[PDB]
């Protein structure tokens, strides 16, 4: 990207004056997000302003940070609108910093959201959620991922921290900087040493560098475990340095406390050693729907 100079796309281009920057939201690693006001997005009612989130490069940006930003933008162009995916609102691509303008989620990411609602239990440290609530979180994220897979897209970074919660408590998948398009190819091969959090990586992705929708399913299993620990961190006590060996020996996380055996069996299913023997996101959606219907 050190000189692939960005083209223009009038469909998505929003002039920089129609954007007013304010408080910073997220931080760290590959970029930076600030809260902003956008003047006349939907056009047909062009004098109202919308609260939006703006992704941009941070202070000491690297080539790959920029590459990731651009890629996130284009990927979100390809994916399209869906109820459970933070969708693209616009972009500032010419004559200044790259600005990727996306939907704003007032209630933060799923991990924070879940941790803010932990009952005063012994396995821990707002108002609590019912079982049907959590299972509905799982269901929503599953819908989003099913849609992603229908569009031949691999997220590669599916985790609680990358799921956002809206004002109406809707789940919306975010962070597409590492997302890859696998239209008309069997898999995606990763660089020699990856840039994705190890504890969410499927074994075939960690050891062999193969990414498919199935590895995303693995990640979703870890996400289930995160949801029903109400924001716990995967493989508690286990340092990354020691996870490898464990995974190569068949180690799997235990059943979280407040969790049915059906859901833990779903987690274990997502964590199958053989990728092809894992459920698809469609099957996961069907299952989670069935379970939602049988819960209160």
Author numbering: 460 to 584, 592 to 762
Question: What are the paper's exact sentences on this?
Answer:
Importantly, aberrant FGF/FGFR signaling has been linked to several developmental syndromes and a broad range of human malignancies. The involvement in the pathology of many cancer types provides a strong rationale for development of effective agents for these targets; consequently, there is a large ongoing effort to develop FGFR inhibitors as anticancer treatments. A number of crystal structures of FGFR KD in non-phosphorylated and phosphorylated forms have been reported. The 3D-structures highlighted the features that undergo substantial changes and play a key role in the activation process; of particular importance is the A-loop and so called “molecular brake”.
The residue corresponding to R669 in FGFR3 is conserved and also mutated in all other FGFRs in cancer as well as in FGFR2 in bone dysplasia. To assess the mechanism that underpins activation, we first analyzed the R to G replacement in the context of FGFR1 KD that is more amenable to crystallography compared to FGFR3 KD. R675G FGFR1 KD variant also has higher activity compared to the WT. Notably, in the inactive FGFR1 KD there is direct hydrogen bonding between R675 and H650 from the A-loop; in addition, R675 is found to share a tight van der Waals interaction with active site tyrosine Y653 and H650 (bottom left inset). These interactions are disturbed and broken in R675G mutant (top inset), thus favoring the A-loop to adopt an open conformation as found in the active FGFR1-3P (bottom right inset). In turn, this open conformation of the A-loop leads to several rearrangements of various control elements in the KD – including ordering of spine residues, dissociation in the molecular brake interacting residues, repositioning of the αC-helix and movement of the N-lobe toward the C-lobe. We suggest a similar allosteric mechanism for FGFR1 R675G and corresponding FGFR3 R669G mutation that is in this case triggered by the loss of inhibitory interactions in the vicinity of the A-loop that involve the R675/669 residue. Moreover, we have established that an infrequent cancer mutation corresponding to R669G in FGFR3, also found in bone dysplasia, greatly enhances kinase activity of FGFR. Nevertheless, structural studies of this mutation in the context of FGFR1 KD (R675G) are fully consistent with its activating potential. Furthermore, we here reveal a new feature of FGFR KD that stabilizes the inactive conformation which, when disrupted by mutations, can result in activation – namely, a set of interactions in the vicinity of the A-loop that involve R669/675.
